[PDB]
Amino acid sequence: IGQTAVPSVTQKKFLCDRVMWRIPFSSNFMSMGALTDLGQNMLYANSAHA
Amino acid sequence: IGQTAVPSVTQKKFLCDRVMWRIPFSSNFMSMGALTDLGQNMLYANSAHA
């Protein structure tokens, strides 16, 4: 700071404590029901996907 | 053993060498015939299971 402030770089981060990261299995990431649409849209019929 | 015997942990195991384990596809696990009851039980038949 001031008229003798040294040359500088900026450092960026966040913290997010008690959370868990989420990724909904939904054709868009909104919650529209507990039984998501991908959870009932042709990952049902045999499917068996790795 | 004797008056000076040391406190001890008990280990239990089994061996079953020449055998090959089996699970009959029969409703009560018995050899009622070579063609089992469940193999005729036309659910686990024509309308095919994974």
Partner: protein, 98 residues
């Protein structure tokens, strides 16, 4: 059947319970609630909501033109809403770096 039997999809408790119990539960929610002991399904809508054509959720545009005067800065964008899409303008913002 097992999603219907386990109440993962299908009827609500007010549909699958016997009618005698539903009137009992209603008559006593004050003062002895049964209304946390039966599962109701909830089910997402599978048709007419989301597309399965390939399509971006977010677009970034760059200024088709810009002006950089002594006291202000201009940028022009061709905001192109394609066919079969709609833009709630509340979702837009200008991202400035400097």
């Amino acid at each position: 059947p097992q999603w219907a039997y386990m109440h993962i999809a299908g009827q609500d408790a007010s549909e699958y319970l016997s009618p005698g119990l539903v009137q009992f539960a209603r008559a006593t929610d004050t003062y002895f609630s049964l209304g946390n002991k039966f599962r109701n399904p909830t089910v997402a809508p599978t048709h007419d909501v989301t597309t399965d054509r390939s399509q971006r959720l977010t677009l970034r545009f760059v200024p088709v033109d810009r002006e950089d005067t002594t006291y202000s800065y201009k940028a022009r964008f061709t905001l192109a809403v394609g066919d079969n899409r709609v833009l709630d303008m509340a979702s837009t913002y200008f991202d400035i770096r400097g």
